[model samples]
Target: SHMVDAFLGTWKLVDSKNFDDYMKSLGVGFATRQVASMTKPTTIIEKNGDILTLKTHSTFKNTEISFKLGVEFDETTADDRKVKSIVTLDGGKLVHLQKWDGQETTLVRELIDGKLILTLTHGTAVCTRTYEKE
Candidate 1:
């Protein structure tokens, strides 16, 4: 809970880099990647004792997910892919994983200098998306 407390807030997108490349590595095509990269979503993380609810809001799409730490569940991703997903608090970083069709993607979220930093990885591509807490 202490770890989650630091992440509980609405975070506004500050900047992102190599996101289109990361999507390319994920097999996402040109037009999809373009609009997806153009999106700037507001992130919200909420918790209730054991369950954590994470939300992403943008004009393109809004996605919400809830799960307990270290537990896995079925998830429908923003691109409409159904995958197995899990979220865990590992060494103060929020580590999220999605697996589908034998492929896996990792997202590591942490607070660095009071700002939210996201390290997104898909295959050999990586993207860094940062946010400012609101």
Candidate 2:
């Protein structure tokens, strides 16, 4: 299962798709967008009971995301800049509930293609993201 303790180690982004659209939706621009696209992200996940930490590291950035098993918290992504992200975990599935200036939404994660599939949602708009181990 993707939620296993073995998922703790660092991962590298081997190949990805649609993350561009996701980034664009997040309001990321040209320079950072281009850089993130070509980035080989290093992902490290650490789990302790119902709490977990997901860290995505790259040349241009190092992002750490942590949330309680079933609770929500304010998230601040590097490029997203101002959006307040609320991340939570559900039955081992990663869930993100984001709120930006009054608009709230959700993003769910599932394992697919031997990688983690992040599904973003906002007013019915959806995008997919993929990642692999280093």
Candidate 3:
């Protein structure tokens, strides 16, 4: 049966649609934005039982977030901010919502055309990142 297992793999970032605007909306600093904008990151997803660990790796920094499906937890961003995070499986997409300092963000990951599509939305800014399976 198709489940989170379908998303278990290493994915290399390929392209971004409006990523700069999205990051700016998140209040990412200049230095952090410079590093993040230039680095081609890789993401690894590991699912076990009800828990899933999502990791994004790059030369500048790495981010690891672990959570169980349908559960809320505290998450520390790579930039050192605390957020209330929740992940859920809706249809075939993994939806992650995070709330921090009165800002709300949503990330939706799904498979499309043999690649992973990660959509990030904050306020009115939206970024769509395409990742190739590795």
- 1-134 per-residue lDDT for model 2 (tens digits): 35556456666665566766777776678787788788777778788666788887778888887776556566777765555656655565667777778776677766655777667766645666666665
Which should have the higher lDDT, number 2 or number 3? 3
Ranking according to lDDT, highest score first:
1, 3, 2
Scored against the true structure, residue 129 in model 1 reaches a CA lDDT of 98
Residue 25 accuracy (lDDT) in model 1: 85
Predicted structure 1, TM vs. truth: 0.95
Query: On a 0 to 1 TM-score scale, where does candidate 2 land against the true structure?
Result: 0.76
**Candidate 1 residues 65-128, lDDT tens each?**
9999889999998878799999999788999999999999998999999789999998779999
For model 2, which pairs clash?
11-134, 12-133, 12-134
lDDT of candidate 3 vs native?
0.90
Best by TM-score: 1
| Residue-level error in angstroms, candidate 3, position 9 | 0.7
RMSD of 2: 3.0
Query: What TM-score against the true fold does each predicted structure earn?
Result: 0.95, 0.76, 0.94
Candidate 3 deviant stretches above 4 angstroms? none
